[model samples]
Target: ADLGAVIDFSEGVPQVVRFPLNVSSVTERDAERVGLEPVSKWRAYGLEGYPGFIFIPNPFLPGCQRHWVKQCLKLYSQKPNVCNLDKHMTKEETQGLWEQSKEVLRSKEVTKRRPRSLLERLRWVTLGYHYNWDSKKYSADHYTPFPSDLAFLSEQVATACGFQGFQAEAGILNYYRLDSTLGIHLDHSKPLLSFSFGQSAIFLLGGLKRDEAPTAMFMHSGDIMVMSGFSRLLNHAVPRVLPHPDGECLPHCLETPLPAVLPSNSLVEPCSVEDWQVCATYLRTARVNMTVRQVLA
Candidate 1:
């Protein structure tokens, strides 16, 4: 991997971006409702040149990230949502990814062989407006209902970034393995909200053009990145996916327990203990990134 100009987060501290949050949209409730911290407690930052880019260095409460990890491996990967697997296999074949991949993923023996399971093969999942990756266009007719929990999570982050009424109109839940790498590419015309979980990634964000060098940022587990303005000019990609600091175990950030007092409507409660067991194991070598976009006013 190219090591030049990578914003070594260790040496380069990202400047904090403070602006009044839209508590009006959320109306100031317990984030336990959605597994997040209060708007007042969130930390947002920016690296110069990109006016709209903001980074939330893991605002998730202890144990709450489990819900999202479970959702990516179980819930969101199923049904009306679109995925890369859909292009290769029948709808029935693609549905049972969690079950198919669980045995080996949770197996005690570290078998270095066998084919990659369906779950591991998961490349991308599209929500709301199903993106036409081949056609390179989002058609009006091809769409599905977005996941509600994710919409709420996205709204909370969007409002924090000083954008009011930003909705999770479209999303791409991308699954990345240790070998994964995304080339530098342009983003959508709408506001961008991205969430990162599991292993860390070498995020390369550039201000000017591909000809110029990109500043590397470490997007660790639970980190968040949002882009609202100047969405077109920025080109970014993950040149490398670094192993979790804690190795095969869930990173230190995600291993903490839930808050002492749980909110009555705790969103994390839905992810069954049984399900998270597999997600935790699977995450040892995987990274799930859900990037949300606001398609409407």
Candidate 2:
């Protein structure tokens, strides 16, 4: 992991208690309590059985959940969605890739699954950019299934959050470079599980309609957020990515997989948490992200 420096494991426990107030034990239990409920349907109507994505800080309960997230974010921030270069990967190239991927993407021999409903929108991104909803151009990234390390962490998060054996099937890596953007959209039509890492990013959680302004929140690194039931699929997008001050933002552990693969020579480089930062750099040079999801097909 070339870009591993960015993952932040500090969300749940402070490395040093600046203040006497320490709520680690109490907060952990309390948050876990809230996370125990069953996964609700996305927005309760927009989709059939999808629940809004859930986030839980330091849910893994052991060595460096913070480290994992920070590393993950850094790496993720670095990886670019090469698919955006459509000219380099024309329809023909896509078809070839799709054909090669059919066995993995299709359900038990399903060749092509068009996204007729929002649930069908389940996909993963490696790097993303702010998207233009009106233009319909989005940077889509496809990563190798769910990374094993990430899956391990995700499972820990899900369990502590009360899900016994939850598994995140697909990941949609969206990239947002300077000026990149996304329009109001809903994953409520499907189930979505999202994670925020890296220097804190902004999340514009919108109301049901486009006219209603969305509530903007600065999502700090290591924060695990859940939007399900009523909130799932409610219009949301990173209308824009604010300029990030160098050295000011922290990272999340889940973002550690990107750079370990790209631009790393197997002989000179060995993959590990160390590479997460390289991964984030690969992503943030400019990217917007949203991981629409679906139950395993």
Candidate 3:
């Protein structure tokens, strides 16, 4: 009665009211204990047992989330090949092409061509297991070691959430601009772990066919979603990326001091405030999503 839930539909019974699904609150402690204590129940969003999915909100602390994003940018920098416009063309050549392309659009010579910068043209990359877009396959020829920190953290998160040995062998880092969109598709992997950073997106989790209605939800920064079991092969996509009003003002624990003792590899080394400054500024107009998966094993 307090929540206004509809419980009765009898002819003589009074109507029951139900609170909106968005009605909820969380304390600081509750938010912190999300993954540690089963703080929230797993809500199913598919056809009974056939469609399996679980969304864990606020599973990571602000500091931890910052660490992951910073690390992603680090890995991104080290592997320029991942975001390379084309292996055949040099960086200068690529930029020059985009420059000319921009000029063509401005002159109204190419009516159908839209103006795009070099950065916008370079959108995503495959980190651990590089998938060959041209071949439409995951090739061993281009295999690179998955970043250790990413693999370890992903495995740990999976274990803590009930899935065991969720070793991430491959990952796709999607860089989304304000107008970016992901086409609906089904992944063949058994289990998939998705992480969101910077801006938010409207994620649509669909069923067996393109005609099936999808459940759209906001995937905010620091949110982690796992697709497994019956939902392992379900169709999903991002039709829209929501812009952050606060822009780069969002919490990234940028100023928070890190631990005194750091790893020899220094994965925890404070990301160059310089790098993050550039990165965060770019993120103000973009969203980054990494979906880590165990491709073969």
Q: Which candidate number has the best TM-score?
A: 1
TM-score quality measure for candidate 2:
0.45
Model 2 over residues 95-186: C-alpha lDDT tens digits?
33322323243345433444321112212334223344476543243333444444544443444434444565555554444544455442
What's the lDDT for residue 238 in model 2? 57
> What's the lDDT of the predicted structure labeled candidate 3?
0.55
lDDT for residue 255 in candidate 2, whole number 0-100: 38
- Put down candidate 3 lDDT per residue, 82-169, tens digits, no spaces: 5555554564555364334334434635343554545455566667667776887787766666777667656655654556656788
Best-to-worst order by TM-score is: 1, 3, 2
Stretches of model 1 off by over 4 angstroms after superposition: 1-30, 106-109, 181-190, 207-210, 246-248, 259-262
Query: CA lDDT of each candidate?
Result: 0.73, 0.38, 0.55
TM-score: which is higher, 1 or 3?
Answer: 1
How big is the positional error of residue 142 in model 3, measured in Å on the Cα after superposition? Answer: 1.3
What would you estimate as the lDDT of candidate 2?
A: 0.38
lDDT of model 3 at residue 9? 16
For all predicted structures, in order, the TM-scores are: 0.85, 0.45, 0.65
Arranged by lDDT with the best first, the candidates are 1, 3, 2
